[PDB]
């Protein structure tokens, strides 16, 4: 039972804590937490490939794909690890994050832990922009803010 | 650079009335996804900081204290970057100076009308009411 925690921060006001849990190895990951500061809406939320942010959110590089696939959504089959889909934050700019993905891992191949997860400031479209960009980052915009997923007790 | 805040509308009123309380913001960082929570305020002669309404820049939630009631309504235009504090039904414990200001977007319910945690104050506006 893994589990592990995030927290996001960037040079603007969106904050966050983010725990992930993986009660059986090569399992779906839990991925809950909250975070504050967001534009009411649609916000990109992924995990990018590098733990690294020497340079800030940019240094995290794309979003974490392994194999070689092109962007799409949680639930499509054409999709990076990384990607995670949308949060959700309300009038007050709180996302309540609640996830269940079975393609991220928190050990083998598919493993995050060391890698940066991202909130982005525009939505992710799923991959269904009809340009470049949506089969590559979802059109989610600049990164809002980032944080490394380390092992949490 | 600096997020400048100028109020305007108070003035003298009677006991039962309207008065509406705009404050426009200016300069600071103007980027889109920067948010705050901009909250009305009040010094009354004698008393410290109080807090009567605030709402979000980055969507539309609205909180107000207890002294006021269904009295206010605060409303914002964000094109504008433009917070209305409408002032009706007024009481004359109502009299101090109204100064409007902006606090963090991320700050935690409770803190949010909480003038500790506010950053950039403005000039103010003095709010008397009449019985």
């Known amino acids: 039972a893994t589990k592990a925690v995030c927290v996001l921060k960037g040079d603007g006001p969106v904050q966050g804590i983010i725990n992930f849990e993986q009660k059986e190895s090569n399992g779906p990951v839990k991925v809950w937490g909250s975070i504050k500061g967001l534009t009411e809406g649609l916000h990109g939320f992924h995990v990018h490939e590098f733990g690294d942010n020497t340079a800030g959110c940019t240094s995290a590089g794309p979003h974490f794909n392994p194999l070689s696939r092109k962007h799409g959504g949680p639930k499509d089959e054409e999709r990076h690890v990384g990607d995670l889909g949308n949060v959700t934050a309300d009038k007050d700019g709180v996302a309540d994050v609640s996830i269940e993905d079975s393609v991220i891992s928190l050990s083998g191949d598919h493993c995050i832990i060391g890698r940066t997860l991202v909130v982005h400031e525009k939505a992710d479209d799923l991959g269904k922009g009809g340009n470049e960009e949506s089969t590559k980052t979802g059109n989610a915009g600049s990164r809002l803010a980032c944080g490394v997923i380390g092992i949490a007790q | 650079s600096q997020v400048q805040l100028q109020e305007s509308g108070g003035g003298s009123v009677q006991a039962g009335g309207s008065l509406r309380l705009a404050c426009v913001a200016s300069?600071?960082?103007?980027?889109?996804?920067?948010?705050?929570?901009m909250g009305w305020y009040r010094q009354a002669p004698g008393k410290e900081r109080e807090g009567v309404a605030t709402?979000?820049?980055?969507?539309?939630?609205?909180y107000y204290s207890d002294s006021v009631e269904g009295r206010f309504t605060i409303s914002q235009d964000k094109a504008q970057r433009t917070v209305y504090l409408q002032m009706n039904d007024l009481k004359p414990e109502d009299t101090a100076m109204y100064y409007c200001?902006?606090?963090?977007?991320?700050?935690?319910?409770?803190?949010?009308?909480?003038?500790?945690?506010?950053?950039?104050w403005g000039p103010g506006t003095q709010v008397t009411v009449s019985s």
């Open positions: 200001a902006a606090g963090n977007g991320a700050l935690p319910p409770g803190r949010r009308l909480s003038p500790q945690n506010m950053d950039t």
């Open positions: 300069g600071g960082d103007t980027r889109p996804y920067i948010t705050y929570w």
């Open positions: 709402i979000y820049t980055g969507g539309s939630g609205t």
